[PDB]
């Protein structure tokens, strides 16, 4: 019940070299279960008045779930009923990215008037920030219009939450007695887990 | 996840309108109500594999239980056209039915969206307004008149004539929902297309008389029963989206507006969470002389219709 005081994402991926595709689902299920227990055991019907926004471990859990979902979707190229939509520019972008990676690893109106008509009336660098501004705006509009892979992760997390809720509801007495124990004695270990699983 | 109550869902317009309301992805509860033949409609609609539940209530005795937690109230009740029957007795029957229904919704659920479909809605919306005024529960922002059918007919005719792709074609319609008072704004039609004179003339008269063309094409078999249900379902879906919090819910309805001297007028409005939120004031400025004299001609007719409605709605018992 005392407050703690961070980079577990890289350790699991650097330790998993030739692991299965099913353990990713288990990792995602384990990284999205605390919110299920919180939503279940917090009393209904405030106007969301008692949530714990922007604290320590929920951000890391969200980042871990997002990274796991991205890793699962980017490597899909039975277990899954359907697959990710696979935006039809990812393929050639991956090819060009691999080619560039292998190449890398293989190594204000012109205030002086023109006396000759051949010279221009404007300097080449006069209107250059506006060109970059327009290019950046157009690129932002182009990139923020083609994420056809945002409605897939949400429903996957929804089914994960539904399974976690259905599993937690039947075994609610376990977490109920265990919460009573944690409120009773301040510190708590895994031997007490295995003892109190009854 | 909202509740819709159709009052008169066993007539001509009611059954296709109820079927279309059932297939909406936002309805979760549907309360059918009519004086008779509502058990069969509920039996028909209870087998579709749509999560919108269906319950029915029969008779005015159970009408009190029909309006619990209802967010949108749909009133398509009113007998269709009968042989030998004139305008005044039809207006009396439809106005009495809508008067009882508005009294019921005022007694039970006064914070629900009210959609009036019974014809003529030009003289029926003032009746509902006066009855709601008599109970002290009148909200001018939560009472609409369905005139969407004129907009749909205008879009269809304009896309058929100008050979435009029908998805983008929308034509503003002002005035009311009865004959000459419907004025399509063909000069403000998107996508931008240039019209001639006789084309505008024939399109306007076709838009104004499409209703009578429908009723004489059926050879006295009633009125429009699939297009009216289409327009009512479109307006119900738009109102349900308005309750969902979308900030771009714009429709064409016959509501109480002060853009002219007329208390009630059909125009483009913007609906929000609490009902009416805005009225498009730019519809009446920018008209040519054709639309100007059309508005001047339809103003007196709409004023007479609204006066007749208010005159009936305050008759002694």
């Amino acid at each position: 019940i005392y407050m703690k005081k961070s980079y577990l994402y890289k350790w699991y991926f650097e330790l998993g070299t030739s692991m299965k595709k099913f353990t990713i689902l288990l990792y995602l299920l384990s990284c999205s279960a605390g919110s299920v227990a919180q939503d279940l055991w917090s009393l209904p019907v405030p106007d969301e008045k008692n949530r714990i926004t922007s604290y320590g471990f929920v951000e890391n859990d969200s980042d871990l779930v997002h990274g796991l979902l991205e890793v699962q979707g980017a490597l899909v190229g039975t277990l899954l009923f359907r697959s990710e939509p696979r935006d039809p520019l990812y393929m050639m972008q991956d090819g060009s990215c691999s080619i560039v990676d292998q190449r890398f690893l293989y190594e204000t109106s012109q205030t002086d008037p023109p006396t000759s008509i051949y010279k221009r009336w404007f300097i080449k660098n006069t209107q250059e920030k506006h060109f970059e501004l327009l290019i950046q705006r157009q690129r932002w509009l182009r990139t923020n219009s083609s994420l056809s892979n945002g409605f897939f992760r949400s429903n996957t997390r929804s089914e994960s939450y539904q399974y976690l809720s259905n599993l937690f509801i039947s075994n609610g007495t376990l977490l109920d007695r265990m919460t009573k124990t944690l409120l009773k004695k301040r510190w708590l270990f895994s031997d007490e887990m295995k003892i109190g699983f009854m | 996840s909202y509740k819709v109550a159709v009052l008169g869902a066993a007539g001509g317009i009611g059954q296709p309108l109820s079927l279309l309301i059932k297939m909406s992805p936002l309805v979760s509860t549907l309360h059918l109500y009519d004086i008779a033949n509502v058990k069969g409609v509920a039996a028909d609609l209870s087998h579709c594999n749509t999560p919108s539940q269906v319950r029915d209530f029969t008779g005015p005795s159970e009408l009190a239980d029909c309006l619990k937690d209802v967010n949108v109230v749909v009133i398509p009740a009113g007998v269709p056209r009968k042989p030998g029957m004139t305008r005044d007795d039809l207006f009396n029957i439809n106005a009495n039915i809508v008067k009882t229904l508005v009294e019921a919704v005022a007694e039970n659920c006064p914070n629900a969206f009210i959609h009036i479909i019974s014809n003529p809605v030009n003289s029926t919306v003032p009746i509902a307004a006066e009855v709601l005024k008599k109970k002290g529960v009148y909200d001018p922002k939560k009472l609409f008149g369905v005139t969407t059918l004129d907009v749909v007919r205008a879009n269809t005719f304009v896309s058929q004539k100008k050979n435009l792709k029908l998805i983008d074609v929308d034509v503003p319609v002002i005035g009311g929902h009865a004959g000459i008072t419907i004025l399509p704004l063909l000069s403000k039609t998107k996508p931008s297309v240039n019209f001639t004179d006789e084309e505008i003339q024939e399109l306007t008269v076709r838009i104004q008389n499409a209703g009578t063309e429908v009723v004489d094409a059926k050879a006295g078999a009633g009125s429009a029963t699939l297009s009216m249900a289409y327009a009512a379902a479109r307006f119900v879906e738009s109102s349900l989206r308005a309750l969902d919090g979308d900030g771009d819910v714009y429709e064409c309805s016959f509501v109480e507006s002060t853009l002219t001297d007329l208390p009630f007028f059909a125009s483009r409005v913007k609906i929000g969470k609490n009902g009416l939120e805005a009225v498009i004031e730019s519809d009446l400025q920018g008209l040519t002389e054709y639309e100007q004299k059309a508005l001047e001609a339809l103003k007196v007719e709409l004023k007479a219709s609204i006066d007749k409605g208010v005159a009936f709605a305050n008759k002694p018992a």
Binding site: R157, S158, K180, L183, K184 | -
Partner: protein, 232 residues
């Protein structure tokens, strides 16, 4: 403006301590209040939705009283409030505990104070790629929350106007007021008390009982897409 801020600060059971409030500080054509958050909130290390709603209601207070008194001709004196509210409102939606936009890929980390931490303004935070419809839900939620706090502020500031112009008259007469004076003046006025927003949900330490659920999680999956158009 200052009187509305003070009134909406002192209409709440558990708002921050009002140190003082001064009109025209050092000749500048402005005004300032000083609010010190309670020590429990500092010791908590996080913020609750009730506490941030606390903040935008109080921040609305000044412009809301200005609009209530002077009418619908709203000036730009509360622009900073109109900024601050919005910022905190964004923390209402960006947060992973939102019911509508919890399980969606919001602002993502590139890779690497104050009680209210603005995660949106982090140097390693750059907004993730969104669709048109998903962004509309973001705008709709922020508008919903802003309008909810706005409606609460208007309703509260028409609930008690006598205290408002009493603190106002104090602000003209003394040109500076303190929290003790403010508390002693509405002590015998009986205002319409707001409900407590930050009361903690707590478990009994040793009462052996199966505390219930509803029976579900409150998260709704993000699936908003219109049907494909005709002529296909």
């Amino acid at each position: 403006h200052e009187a509305g801020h003070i009134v909406l600060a002192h209409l709440f059971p558990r708002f921050d301590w009002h140190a003082f409030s001064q009109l025209l500080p050092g000749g500048k054509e402005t005004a300032v209040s000083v609010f010190y958050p309670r020590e429990d909130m500092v010791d908590q290390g996080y913020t609750t939705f009730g506490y941030m709603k606390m903040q935008m209601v109080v921040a609305h207070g000044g412009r809301c009283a200005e609009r209530v008194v002077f009418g619908d001709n709203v000036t730009d004196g509360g622009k900073d409030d109109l900024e601050k509210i919005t910022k905190i409102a964004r923390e209402m939606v960006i947060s992973p505990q939102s019911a509508r936009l919890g399980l969606t890929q919001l602002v993502k980390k590139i890779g690497m104070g104050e009680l209210i931490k603005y995660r949106w303004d982090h140097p390693h935070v750059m907004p993730a790629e969104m669709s048109v419809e998903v962004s509309e839900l973001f705008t709709r939620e922020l508008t919903r929350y802003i309008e909810e706090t706005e409606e609460l502020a208007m309703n509260a500031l028409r609930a008690n106007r006598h205290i408002l112009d009493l603190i106002t008259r104090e602000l003209l007469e003394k040109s500076r007021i303190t929290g003790l004076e403010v508390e002693e003046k509405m002590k015998d006025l009986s205002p319409l008390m707001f409900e407590d927003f930050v009361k903690p949900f707590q478990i009994n330490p040793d009462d052996e009982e199966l505390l219930p659920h509803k029976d579900r999680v409150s998260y709704q999956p993000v699936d908003l897409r219109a049907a494909p158009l005709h002529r296909s």
